[PDB]
């Protein structure tokens, strides 16, 4: 809705500072967004603006869509989502940057 | 942590209430918020939960429009809102925090709905 | 909603002893990694209080004696050896979707 997709990128590797989390974000990390969907920067005030409207565009279209394939998000993935989400989002800011 | 709930209150039948729960000690936005309300008979009932994050909201839908949750990220506050009260409303109604597991209870409000 | 069938309603035990109290989900709420079930405590006057998350780890503090197993339906809490001040009213609680519905409870007594 006058939103882009961005390109694929890595996921980043989180450390939670403890084992469990750790463990279960290596092992589901698989399962979450690898791209973000973003309006130019343009339509922003900020980087905190951008950054949170991408997160939860792309948590929620994510959702959405892989709803429909059997997926199920319980509450800790959404909470891993919301990190790992917002540090691309900031990746893709960067990467909007860049352009020039 | 803590979660610090307001106290008790008497409310005519037919009236409002809203109900505060004060974190502290953790990430507000880190974790869900569940109200959830103890019965008389000890039973469990779920009211709905709430996203400090981003204020997403879901809500016990057999309830109808009972309940209004919503939170105060400037002070790290989750409020419920309970509207046309009844007799059968009289219960403890609880804030949990919540990642999968409700690890953290606010000390219980209890509210008495009576004439 | 998942359904929750929770027994027994009622427990006695002798100090020293080993309680179980059993949860059956109405649907699988496990991966072949993880399974979504947690067990309180609620003890008189006071919110329950949290002993166990995905089905057998337990929370900080809380001691050895309580254990919580299982896979899939079928999920166990455990007390071994039960204490005096193990007395109250235990629910498991699954957290694969919401709402996260509970058991109907399991008051455990000691005996005497």
């Known amino acids: 809705g006058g939103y882009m997709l961005g390109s694929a990128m890595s996921r980043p590797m989180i450390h939670f500072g403890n084992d469990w989390e750790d463990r279960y974000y290596r092992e589901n990390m698989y399962r979450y967004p690898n791209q973000v969907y973003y309006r130019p920067v343009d339509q922003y005030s900020n980087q905190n603006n951008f950054v949170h409207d991408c997160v939860n565009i792309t948590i929620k279209q994510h959702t959405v869509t892989t709803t429909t394939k059997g997926e199920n998000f319980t509450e800790t993935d959404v909470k891993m989502m919301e990190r790992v989400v917002e540090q691309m989002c900031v990746t893709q800011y960067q990467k909007e940057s860049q352009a020039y | 942590v803590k979660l610090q709930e307001s106290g008790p209150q008497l409310v005519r039948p037919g009236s409002s209430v809203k109900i505060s729960c004060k974190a502290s000690?953790?990430?507000?936005?880190?974790?869900?918020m569940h109200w959830v309300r103890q019965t008389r008979v000890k039973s469990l009932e779920w009211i709905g939960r709430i996203n400090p994050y981003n204020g997403n909201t879901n809500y016990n839908k057999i309830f109808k429009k009972k309940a209004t949750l919503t939170v105060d990220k400037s002070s790290s506050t989750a409020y419920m809102q309970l509207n046309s009260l009844t007799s059968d409303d009289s219960a403890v109604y609880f804030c949990?925090?919540?990642?999968?597991?409700?690890?953290?209870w606010g000390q219980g409000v209890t509210i008495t709905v009576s004439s | 909603d998942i359904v929750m069938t929770q027994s027994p309603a009622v427990l006695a035990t002798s100090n020293g002893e080993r309680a179980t109290i059993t949860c059956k989900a109405s649907?699988?709420?496990?991966?072949?990694?993880?399974?979504?079930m947690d067990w309180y405590q609620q003890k008189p006057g006071q919110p329950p209080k949290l002993l166990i998350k995905?089905?057998?780890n337990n929370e900080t503090g809380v001691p050895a004696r309580f254990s919580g197993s299982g896979t899939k339906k079928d999920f166990t809490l455990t007390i071994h050896p039960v204490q005096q001040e193990d007395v109250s009213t235990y629910y498991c609680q699954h957290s694969w979707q919401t709402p996260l519905t509970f058991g109907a409870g399991t008051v455990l007594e000691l005996k005497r």
């Open positions: 649907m699988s709420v496990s991966t072949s990694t993880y399974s979504y």
């Open positions: 995905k089905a057998s």
């Open positions: 949990a925090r919540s990642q999968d597991a409700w690890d953290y």
């Open positions: 000690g953790y990430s507000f936005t880190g974790y869900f």
